[PDB]
Amino acid sequence: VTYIFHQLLDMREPVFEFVRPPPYHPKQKRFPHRQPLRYLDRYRDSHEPTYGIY
Amino acid sequence: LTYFSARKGKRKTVKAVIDRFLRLHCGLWVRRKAGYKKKLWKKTPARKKRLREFVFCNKTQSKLLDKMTTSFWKRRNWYVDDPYQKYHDRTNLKV
Amino acid sequence: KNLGGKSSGRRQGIKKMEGHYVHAGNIIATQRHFRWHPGAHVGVGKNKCLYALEEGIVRYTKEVYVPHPRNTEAVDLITRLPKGAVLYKTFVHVVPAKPEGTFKLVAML
Amino acid sequence: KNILVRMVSEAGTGFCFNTKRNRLREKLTLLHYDPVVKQRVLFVEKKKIRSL
Amino acid sequence: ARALDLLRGLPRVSLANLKPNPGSKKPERRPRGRRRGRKCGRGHKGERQRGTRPRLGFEGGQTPFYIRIPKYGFNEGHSFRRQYKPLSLNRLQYLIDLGRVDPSQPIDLTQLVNGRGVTIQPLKRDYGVQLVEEGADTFTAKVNIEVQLASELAIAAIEKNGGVVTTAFYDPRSLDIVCKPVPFFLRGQPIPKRMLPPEELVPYYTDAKNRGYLADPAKFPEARLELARKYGYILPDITKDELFKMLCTRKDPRQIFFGLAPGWVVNMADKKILKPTDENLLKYYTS
Amino acid sequence: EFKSIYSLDKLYPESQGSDTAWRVDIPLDRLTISYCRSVNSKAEVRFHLATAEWIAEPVRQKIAITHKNKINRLGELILTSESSRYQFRNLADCLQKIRDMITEASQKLHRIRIENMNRERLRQKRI
RNA sequence: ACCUCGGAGCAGAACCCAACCUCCGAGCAGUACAUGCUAAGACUUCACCAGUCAAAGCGAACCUCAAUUGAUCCA
Ligand SMILES: [Mg+2]
Ligand SMILES: [Mg+2]
Ligand SMILES: [Mg+2]
């Protein structure tokens, strides 16, 4: 099918991927009472040390 | 607590509070669960997994712990290889 | 001479009535004996509590009860019935809302 | 009637876990799971902790 | 402004015209009258009206929240942990662009304090600055920094652009003299010698991978070459350009300031430096 | 200047020259390095696999076969990284992917196994 | 006579509901030794503390009972 798209149709082949919907998390609270400490990681998006104004 | 000491006239921290809790700079107090090292032979592993967790505190528990410590304990701390350092700033709240 | 009996209410019953949107893992209803049975996309805990296995809408139906053949209590309750007699129970279903993912274009190689 | 004993792993050692067993029956040997070896390994009971 | 032109037509501002900005002064509430005081806000007679409510944390007799909970060492050795103020490369590019830190000189910790780029306080046990990889892309500066800790990616971002990083050590005493040097030269003491790291930190500052100031200058080209291979930049040789004599200068260990030596007494007043010539002092200061 | 006991001329006396601290496989002029701040960035190294002189010919065949799903229409091996906010760390991730491909090339499946075996059981049909 | 925990009635149908109110009980036993490790989402005894349920995952196979219990400090 690589041969079909490139050779005789003369176009780049399209490649698809089965994308699942993003996981539901509830609305983040100020005081996440009794949740574990992992709760703050459900709501972050970078796994790298941010340093702020410094 | 002591609101005005007799030597300095300053507030004092309650040292029980420091000995048990962890203040994150955003205002969240982290604690350990009560009984996490008691009678483990009669607890189901789900429950033991629940007790070995670092659990956040309530709003009023948080304000009670703020009033019982002083501004030294509320301060930015740039430690070297701090385990809790990624949990100080609060990411991505929409209030 | 009547000591005891000071236990409080268990706060059981239905948490998600019919029509309610439900995310995966929400407890639908906690019971003490099987008042409601798990139907489609509904799981059961050790405490006979019905939770949800998909995101969707809770529906309650009435279905034919046919127990597992290794369940000698209910199976012995079957064989005592007359020839037309069919047991029903009320079941809880979660009708799943979303598709479980889409195909999306990634790259024009 | 029962005893809470500790079970010491024979390999991947330093790993214990506690069990119940009767006062009267023999000293337990089990096949528990070591997460240090990450295998199932024989454990042998070494000390009774508390007679529950 | 139309507003001074308003001030023409108005009577003169005096001590009889002045008035606080409305909103500044909330009015004092005091317990007199029908509303502010009959019970005066204490309620009915109990223990909270009498004035004797128990201490903060007392839950009336059940074991309090802040005591039902196991002691765990979150804060166990808090005042002996070392702290390092972050200085991002975004921040340092920002200081170089606005003239506050001159990159044609060595950037010691005094130059980051005098440009007011970084505020470090030696009490509260900051042991100095750590470089931080934030802003590594879009960091375009040839610089010579002496920073007490540095991540690999920050060393890579400096050494890409033709820079030099080294990681020095400072005692609390030494760091305190480094940050604010002028209130030390009014103290009258001779310049001390900075101490070597403790045993926890000697394996840090003797490694060439993190550019230790006690490491070999014979293992550095291997480490510079390794980062240049890892992060995909061709390693420029610092030897060619004209700033090389500037980009080579380090102060040795046991030297706090740059051009000075331990044991000297800076006389700020008549602008002299008194140097000792006794042999015992020279054995002690050049140790 | 000032030199104490712990100067680097005394701790390491074998390396005493000033030039000793500064005297010095994939070539980067060959690769095409492109960026897109798609939150992470996204580095993208592409290079034409056929013309790559700095990879051996059998290793170019093993790469041309195993990683054929990365190869462009124009014969360019294209490989990206969006694992970091810093484009140094994404570029390093891409180059490490390349070095991993050359080292591995020099020296769910189950369902497809069964569906192929049954497809060969229906292939049992001759003229 | 009692003091804690659970079941039933009161309290008929979501939840909750007292009494020196009416009746039963509990303070274990048995089996297993992956009764491993992790983790979305929830319930919750009207607070807190405690309690419960749990998909996916890694690793493996191919728990019953209602209650069946005890914080912190200290050892
Ligand atoms: Mg009752
Ligand atoms: Mg009650
Ligand atoms: Mg509640």
Side-chain angles (χ1 to χ4, degrees):
Chain A
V1 192
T2 292
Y3 291 163
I4 295 163
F5 279 101
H6 293 293
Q7 286 168 350
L8 50 146
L9 267 66
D10 287 336
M11 62 194 190
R12 298 193 299 283
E13 71 195 10
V15 176
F16 293 99
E17 189 193 6
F18 184 71
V19 175
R20 294 174 188 276
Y24 170 71
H25 295 298
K27 191 192 186 184
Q28 187 178 3
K29 298 187 294 175
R30 279 281 276 279
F31 293 103
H33 173 61
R34 298 173 69 85
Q35 295 299 119
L37 190 68
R38 307 189 290 270
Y39 181 95
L40 294 180
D41 295 333
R42 277 85 166 259
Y43 296 117
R44 77 176 73 218
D45 41 5
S46 185
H47 286 99
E48 280 179 311
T50 182
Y51 283 91
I53 209 51
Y54 306 98
Chain B
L1 73 152
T2 297
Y3 294 88
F4 297 95
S5 69
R7 302 291 201 106
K8 306 296 291 172
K10 291 182 183 171
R11 290 172 83 99
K12 289 197 168 182
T13 73
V14 177
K15 288 297 194 73
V17 163
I18 286 145
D19 219 335
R20 292 156 211 264
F21 287 91
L22 169 73
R23 161 90 180 186
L24 303 179
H25 190 268
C26 51
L28 295 174
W29 292 79
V30 173
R31 66 181 178 82
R32 195 70 117 109
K33 292 197 74 71
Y36 76 104
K37 54 166 61 172
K38 294 219 64 60
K39 305 179 179 61
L40 285 187
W41 63 276
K42 57 161 71 169
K43 294 181 165 65
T44 182
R47 185 179 171 183
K48 286 150 71 170
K49 166 66 160 56
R50 284 193 286 273
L51 289 170
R52 288 182 280 108
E53 283 186 353
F54 290 143
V55 148
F56 286 109
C57 291
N58 202 353
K59 171 184 185 184
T60 66
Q61 284 166 359
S62 174
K63 303 309 190 302
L64 189 266
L65 293 174
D66 282 329
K67 290 182 186 296
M68 271 173 164
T69 62
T70 60
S71 309
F72 177 75
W73 298 97
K74 269 78 161 173
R75 160 237 155 68
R76 303 287 299 184
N77 290 313
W78 294 105
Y79 299 140
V80 270
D81 299 319
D82 186 68
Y84 302 109
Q85 193 158 24
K86 71 172 176 171
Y87 296 111
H88 282 150
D89 183 75
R90 196 73 187 276
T91 59
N92 216 343
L93 262 174
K94 194 173 67 182
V95 176
Chain C
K1 291 195 170 186
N2 290 309
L3 53 94
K6 285 176 178 173
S7 174
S8 295
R10 284 84 62 82
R11 268 78 174 175
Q12 290 177 355
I14 284 176
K15 271 76 199 187
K16 292 293 191 283
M17 290 289 178
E18 167 156 352
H20 285 182
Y21 194 72
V22 145
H23 297 285
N26 285 98
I27 294 169
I28 290 167
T30 60
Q31 72 253 26
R32 173 54 183 255
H33 299 96
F34 273 108
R35 181 166 172 185
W36 311 281
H37 291 77
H41 302 298
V42 169
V44 149
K46 306 163 169 81
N47 282 116
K48 285 186 274 308
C49 77
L50 297 172
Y51 65 98
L53 283 172
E54 292 295 326
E55 298 189 2
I57 287 160
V58 176
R59 302 293 188 191
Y60 295 77
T61 61
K62 303 291 202 278
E63 289 299 322
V64 186
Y65 180 69
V66 267
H68 195 278
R70 297 179 180 175
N71 187 8
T72 185
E73 293 180 0
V75 169
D76 285 337
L77 195 143
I78 287 173
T79 65
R80 297 172 177 267
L81 288 181
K83 200 72 167 282
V86 169
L87 299 185
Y88 280 4
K89 303 290 183 176
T90 86
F91 289 0
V92 195
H93 314 290
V94 171
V95 179
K98 297 177 176 181
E100 52 273 59
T102 67
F103 293 93
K104 284 187 181 182
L105 187 137
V106 161
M108 292 298 296
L109 264 303
Chain D
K1 178 170 171 64
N2 291 321
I3 299 179
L4 198 279
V5 299
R6 87 168 72 252
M7 302 286 303
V8 172
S9 65
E10 279 298 323
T13 62
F15 190 80
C16 299
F17 85 105
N18 310 332
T19 55
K20 291 170 61 173
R21 73 108 190 278
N22 291 107
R23 286 179 61 183
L24 288 176
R25 59 89 57 79
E26 298 183 358
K27 297 184 168 187
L28 281 178
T29 60
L30 293 178
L31 271 178
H32 199 77
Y33 164 71
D34 264 315
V36 178
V37 188
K38 295 164 191 178
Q39 287 190 12
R40 293 173 201 179
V41 160
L42 287 174
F43 292 24
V44 177
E45 74 92 7
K46 291 282 99 178
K47 188 165 190 175
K48 75 95 162 184
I49 297 172
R50 187 181 63 79
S51 68
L52 71 146
Chain E
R2 304 181 190 178
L4 298 168
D5 298 338
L6 280 181
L7 278 182
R8 283 195 204 81
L10 266 62
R12 88 166 87 254
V13 177
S14 61
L15 291 176
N17 290 114
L18 291 180
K19 187 248 290 189
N21 200 4
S24 308
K25 270 55 189 285
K26 267 179 63 196
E28 176 167 4
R29 305 292 182 183
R30 46 191 314 252
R32 268 90 172 109
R34 185 171 91 84
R35 194 250 180 253
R36 281 321 186 295
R38 169 262 210 105
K39 301 281 198 184
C40 301
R42 307 293 290 267
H44 298 302
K45 295 182 191 151
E47 192 182 12
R48 73 267 223 104
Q49 165 163 0
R50 263 60 168 256
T52 323
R53 264 197 285 176
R55 62 183 183 268
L56 191 55
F58 186 68
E59 294 189 7
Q62 71 170 352
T63 51
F65 170 67
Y66 78 102
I67 273 180
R68 292 178 73 68
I69 292 173
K71 299 213 183 187
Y72 185 72
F74 294 105
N75 304 302
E76 185 169 12
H78 73 86
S79 62
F80 307 117
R81 302 176 193 167
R82 304 172 181 91
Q83 296 188 0
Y84 290 94
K85 288 289 181 150
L87 156 122
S88 58
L89 287 167
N90 207 329
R91 174 68 167 171
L92 183 121
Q93 182 65 49
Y94 167 73
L95 293 169
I96 289 167
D97 289 337
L98 270 76
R100 283 164 64 181
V101 166
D102 181 81
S104 292
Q105 288 305 112
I107 313 303
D108 199 59
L109 195 147
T110 74
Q111 304 304 318
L112 290 183
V113 170
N114 293 334
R116 294 165 177 101
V118 167
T119 300
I120 68 165
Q121 45 199 338
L123 313 312
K124 296 305 163 298
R125 74 282 311 162
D126 292 333
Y127 272 36
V129 181
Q130 57 168 339
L131 264 168
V132 143
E133 74 277 6
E134 176 192 339
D137 37 6
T138 64
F139 174 73
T140 305
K142 178 179 288 184
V143 75
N144 184 9
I145 338 186
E146 194 84 33
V147 170
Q148 286 81 33
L149 300 184
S151 63
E152 277 196 349
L153 200 144
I155 306 174
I158 289 163
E159 285 182 344
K160 171 175 180 173
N161 298 307
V164 176
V165 201
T166 38
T167 64
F169 177 74
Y170 290 102
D171 309 320
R173 175 177 176 59
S174 174
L175 193 274
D176 184 75
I177 298 161
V178 160
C179 297
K180 301 186 286 302
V182 174
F184 175 77
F185 302 127
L186 300 181
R187 188 173 289 138
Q189 300 168 352
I191 298 170
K193 47 181 189 184
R194 62 169 169 163
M195 298 316 301
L196 303 174
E199 299 84 352
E200 305 94 359
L201 289 175
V202 166
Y204 187 86
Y205 292 102
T206 57
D207 287 347
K209 287 190 176 178
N210 50 21
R211 264 59 167 192
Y213 79 118
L214 290 175
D216 284 353
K219 289 185 179 171
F220 275 1
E222 299 164 357
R224 297 181 65 252
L225 192 272
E226 277 178 4
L227 282 183
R229 285 179 177 180
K230 177 175 178 176
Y231 289 103
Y233 61 90
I234 291 159
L235 196 269
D237 56 345
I238 306 168
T239 316
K240 283 184 181 296
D241 64 339
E242 291 80 7
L243 271 308
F244 171 67
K245 187 176 295 180
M246 188 272 290
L247 292 178
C248 188
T249 60
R250 298 177 198 177
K251 44 190 182 180
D252 58 344
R254 299 160 87 92
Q255 188 185 1
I256 291 175
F257 292 108
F258 207 77
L260 294 91
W264 295 4
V265 175
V266 173
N267 193 7
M268 291 281 288
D270 58 355
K271 295 176 178 183
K272 288 181 180 177
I273 292 174
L274 306 180
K275 307 194 278 196
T277 57
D278 181 73
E279 281 194 356
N280 292 320
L281 295 179
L282 288 177
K283 290 181 198 171
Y284 170 60
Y285 286 120
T286 67
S287 295
Chain F
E1 281 190 350
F2 170 73
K3 290 185 181 180
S4 74
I5 289 180
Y6 291 98
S7 71
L8 291 177
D9 298 333
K10 295 175 184 176
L11 285 177
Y12 307 118
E14 290 189 358
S15 64
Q16 278 183 1
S18 67
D19 292 326
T20 61
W22 314 111
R23 278 180 178 173
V24 181
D25 53 352
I26 290 177
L28 296 165
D29 52 352
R30 184 62 62 80
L31 301 179
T32 301
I33 299 164
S34 60
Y35 297 106
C36 175
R37 286 187 298 288
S38 65
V39 171
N40 302 319
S41 180
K42 183 187 182 185
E44 177 177 1
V45 174
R46 65 183 65 191
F47 69 99
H48 182 69
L49 189 270
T51 196
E53 290 187 351
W54 51 275
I55 308 173
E57 169 64 24
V59 184
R60 275 186 281 181
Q61 291 178 355
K62 294 289 179 62
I63 291 168
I65 288 164
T66 59
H67 295 279
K68 66 188 293 297
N69 302 316
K70 272 79 157 166
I71 297 172
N72 203 355
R73 182 253 196 67
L74 272 77
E76 290 175 355
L77 185 57
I78 296 169
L79 66 164
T80 67
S81 296
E82 52 184 357
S83 57
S84 288
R85 290 193 278 115
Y86 303 104
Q87 69 187 4
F88 280 44
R89 200 185 302 259
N90 291 324
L91 178 63
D93 189 74
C94 291
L95 296 180
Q96 186 55 48
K97 287 178 187 299
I98 298 170
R99 288 197 285 264
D100 284 332
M101 283 188 303
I102 301 171
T103 52
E104 79 188 10
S106 174
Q107 179 59 255
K108 177 55 183 175
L109 210 159
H110 184 69
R111 191 188 186 97
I112 308 167
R113 288 170 184 164
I114 293 174
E115 292 167 355
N116 291 325
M117 284 182 283
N118 294 119
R119 190 187 63 218
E120 289 178 2
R121 285 174 182 169
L122 293 181
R123 187 178 56 78
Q124 290 179 0
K125 184 261 185 70
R126 304 171 178 178
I127 53 91

